[PDB]
Amino acid sequence: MKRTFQPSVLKRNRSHGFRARMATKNGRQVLARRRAKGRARLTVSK
Amino acid sequence: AVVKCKPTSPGRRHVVKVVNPELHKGKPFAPLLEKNSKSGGRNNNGRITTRHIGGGHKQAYRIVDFKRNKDGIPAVVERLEYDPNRSANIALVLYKDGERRYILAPKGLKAGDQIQSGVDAAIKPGNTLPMRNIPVGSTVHNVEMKPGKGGQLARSAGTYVQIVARDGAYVTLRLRSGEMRKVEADCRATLGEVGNAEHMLRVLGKAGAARWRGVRPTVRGTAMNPVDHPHGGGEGRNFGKHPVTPWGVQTKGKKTRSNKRTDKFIVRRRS
RNA sequence: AGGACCGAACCGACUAAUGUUGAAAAAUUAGCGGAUGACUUGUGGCUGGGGGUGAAAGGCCAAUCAAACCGGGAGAUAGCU
RNA sequence: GCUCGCCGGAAGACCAAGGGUUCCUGUCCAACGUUAAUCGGGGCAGGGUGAGUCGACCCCUAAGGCGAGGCCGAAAGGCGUAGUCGAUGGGAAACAGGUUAAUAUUCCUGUACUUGGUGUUACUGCGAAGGGGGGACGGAGAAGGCUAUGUUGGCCGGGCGACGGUUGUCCCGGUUUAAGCGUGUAGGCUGGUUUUCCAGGCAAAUCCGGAAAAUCAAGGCUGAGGCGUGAUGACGAGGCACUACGGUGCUGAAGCAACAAAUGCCCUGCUUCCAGGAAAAGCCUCUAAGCAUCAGGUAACAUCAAAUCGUACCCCAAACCGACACAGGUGGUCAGGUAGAGAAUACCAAGGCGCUUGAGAGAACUCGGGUGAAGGAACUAGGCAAAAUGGUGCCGUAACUUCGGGAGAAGGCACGCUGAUAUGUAGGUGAGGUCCCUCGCGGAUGGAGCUGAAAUCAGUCGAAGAUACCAGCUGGCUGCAACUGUUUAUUAAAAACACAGCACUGUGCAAACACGAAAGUGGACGUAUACGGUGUGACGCCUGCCCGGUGCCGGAAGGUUAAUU
RNA sequence: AAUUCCUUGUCGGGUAAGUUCCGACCUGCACGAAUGGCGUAAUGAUGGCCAGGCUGUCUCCACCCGAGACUCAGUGAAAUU
Secondary structure, eight states: OOOSOOOOHHHHHHHHOHHHHTTSHHHHHHHHHHHHHTOSOOSSOO | OEEEOOOSSTTSTTOEEEOOTTBOOSOOOGGGEEEOOOOOSBOTTSOBOSSSBOOOOOOEEEOOOSSOOOOSOOEEEEEEEOOTTSSSOEEEEEETTSOEEEEEOBTTOOTTOEEOBSTTOOSSTTOEEEGGGSOTTOEEESEESSTTSOEEESOSSSOOEEEEEEOSSEEEEEOTTSOEEEEETTOEEEESOBSOGGGGGOBOOSHHHHHHTTBOOOOOSTTSOTTTOTTOOOSSSOOOSOOOOTTSOOOSSOOOOOOOSSOSSBSSOOO
16 A cells, blocks of 8 residues: 655755755744754755 | 538447548648647636636647738738637738738638738738728628737637728627627728638537547536535535525626726627 | 457456454455546646635545644633543 | 475566665674574674766756846735746767676777867858757557567587487587678658749848749658678687686687567658647857958868766665565566467476474364255345356347447357378468679569468267366346446445536626736637536437516616715 | 335236236326426446246255364463453
8 A cells, every 4th residue: 555655855855955944934934943942953955 | 511420339429520621631830830838727826717627639829810910912822721729720821022821711712812901902801901991781800909909809610790880980890799899990800701610510429529628527516515615515406596606696697797998889788 | 430349467446255452554365347548657846724626425635624734822711520 | 415396477687766885705693583593684893886988967948936127015925027947858979708705888808989179281251149940749550671589400519328119300408799880772751953033031141931934854861671891809518637626727619591570670651530749959051240461160180188976785675665574555678488369377498486483183163175965046135155157160140229239149060189182282481593684782584492271081089179277147027327437545336426418697808707905817829609607417209387476687757765065 | 106104005917825026007195397307229346026057055964175273392462450
């Protein structure tokens, strides 16, 4: 049976990449929250 | 010619085809072609705005000349062609100077016929002149509404217009819908009718034929749930309300013309 | 010639048995339907929650849908256990 | 190591996606492996990925995204022009052999090819963000000509049989070779060259398009395969010597023909139909502004340059998605033998495996199968399940019907092997020879050799000859829906939803309508034979009566009635 | 009647025996003409009924071939309380 997660690197970066987060006001607020919390990995870049 | 297919299988019993051997059996004129991508009834917001649109056969757009502003240069018809973007056919013409263009095919035009446009043009089918120089009571097609922008009326398969009177700078016309409209006596019009009269006698014969045209199936509305359509549902087939669109409009007599901007070029709207 | 006929790949899911702390949070075995088309499939793209999409079942929208998920108002209110 | 069993259109081989050292060698057995473990995709250490030609980057664009100014919007922000990004598509070049414990079209040997820069010589009209050509495109069907590949014969090497026979019409094995370069065939398309003129291609133009003459018909383009060369080479079954019995030096015979034949190639072709089938650059041409003893352009030779990143391994699976070493899911490529219509099915080749608990016993009962006396649906809500029918050719076939169907209706007969007709027939393929020629990959004639159906007659074995696998039960009456299709992923596949057809009604274009505070976009680069909404639902015969109520469409005399004054 | 409460309406067909099925009758509780009426060849993993063939479905079960169940060695769960 086909499951929900079908990996694809190209789509992963275009949907949740660093540059995708910096392209909108709301996306830049996601990074600000994660920086304040101290996350070691801000995005899924690599 | 109208041809009825034999019932060799279900889906062919009721098929009626219109065949015209005069059409060109070859590729069209490349220089007068353009890309035409499908939309699916969706606008720049990505939402569906017109339903029942989707799929179909790939098509290319033919650049047709609706203005006919080349005066004083006779042209000769080369061949008739099939146009997928419209119900009527088109004709490829060649001017003396060596230019080619596409025009709507009149009723009785063939290969080799001569056409011309201008004030001094002859009164023959295929010629375009301002309505000021056209006699009253004659039949025309591809009528301009404002001088210089190109024809917009009577462009379908077998449509035409009739000039009924000429009072001043305006001419009164009877449209195919029966409406009495008047436009300025400076708009160009083409003599004759658009010849595809047999286009109305075709019978698709099966559901798949409609899908080839890009038409998607229509759901009635009385078969839906109340949350989806005013006609809603019910135990069985109830329908105890007045007919109505989605979004709540009558659909059974309620007029919806609310322009009020022109309100002068209409006399005998219809019926 | 054909939304034509028989039938593998491929796409579906009508019947029975098994399984039901299963091999599997929907499968296996034996039969079954379509199979040049309103067909099927790879890669990428667009439509966002009182909104989308829907050959229309209140179906589907990340194992969740008569109003998704995450955080916040929030220690909502509970004449009831 | 010797046997046995299983897969073989995969359970074999090579990749993309995804994973990220799982790859190779040495060493270790606590934990991990559903048991033991000396073993492992486990622990520890070392080693391994070599490119001008493969891919990425790069040049070009599709859907779509972003978007200087701009338009619009309380703020945030939305749309969009010039532009700039975006493959799943277009765009230059390498083949065979050898080699490592682990990489190679990347290293080695042999033999090739492509695009640029600089320089020399000779001859010269060069020049763009512009014009034209080209790139450039659908479905189905029909053959013909070929190759991959297979079979047999010939040839070369070896063999004479654990038990009757086996010096022959006997047995086993091999019989292989590329890109490139030259030739330009089967076949496809198009009539050529010359001169003058012209409201067109945003200006120009020798180019494209158009018009009028003259002169010849042989001109050109495209094109699988074959042949030659590459190759006095490489490879090569088997021998002879090192020899830790793990392997390398040296040497090495034959290397031809016929027939059969693709879903691959000629073919982006040809024929035909309606639903009428991407874009841009590279590339080939034409000139403008400009520059001409320069600069640039064409050809030959020499020389230099071609960077950077990926390359191990798994990839229908124990390494990816499912919490697992999980009977599930996952796109592309390669396609041997006998029988067969076949990529079905049965047994096999190359190759790969026996699925990570075993040993005994031979109770009830459960699961998956085989057979059955007499009866044959008496079972049961119901023939659920099971049994049964099953192939090819010929004969034959009802009611009804929209004349196509119903129909494979139903039903009946014949099927193996051997010999002859015919020491292998009809047919297919086609050598030598003879003659001719525009002598060439030519044509006519010619028939050797090879290959090979079906039918009839006679004989013969068994209980049974479509013997295995494979492979329709059939008929009569009737409700509903015309039909092919669609639907509750995970208890409902239907009489429900679609449907062609029919009717009513709205809409004259800045259309109605829909998404949007707006701009704007879809409808549509469409124009009433068009588009939206609603009901009905092929086709045939038909669709009656009622406008009081509610809605919708018209009408003006009167009464009543808002803000305002 | 996919519509009929009374109801297994009444008569005929089929069966030794038919609340179902088929054909008529009309007392249509409560059919009816595009939320269409009545017919209709072909089609259907659609509903009901009757025959031929066929059989372990059954009268009524018997034997046999395999995988578990049982014994030995290794590893070693769960609901509940």
